């Protein structure tokens, strides 16, 4: 959706955005696994285990 210039990070020293990007990628991955499990109707046991 968005393209940002990496040249704006090293001189500003605001490294929180890189870590936020990594953690948001991880959270979206977990959500993607949940959505894939929900699409193909599965048991509640597998959902609650995951």
């Amino acid at each position: 959706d968005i393209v940002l210039n990496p040249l704006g990070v090293p001189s500003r020293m605001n490294i929180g955005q890189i870590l936020e990007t990594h953690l948001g990628m991880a959270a979206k991955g977990i959500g993607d696994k949940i959505n894939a499990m929900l699409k193909q109707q599965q048991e509640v046991a597998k959902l609650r285990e995951f």
Binding site: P6, I15, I18, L19, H22
Partner: protein
């Protein structure tokens, strides 16, 4: 280029330089990540000695 050739060639050269730099910076795919900030392995022992 300005001192040897003149004014108009310098303007043309500057425009071409900007175009080429933008194109190849885009092509490189240069990014920034958390693993690019490598901490030296001897930092802890130097701190301990100090």
């Amino acid at each position: 280029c300005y001192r040897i050739l003149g004014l108009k060639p310098t303007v043309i050269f500057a425009d071409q330089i900007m175009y080429t730099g933008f194109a190849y910076a885009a092509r490189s795919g240069a990014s920034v990540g958390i693993d690019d900030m490598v901490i030296p392995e001897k930092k802890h022992e130097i701190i301990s000695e100090a």
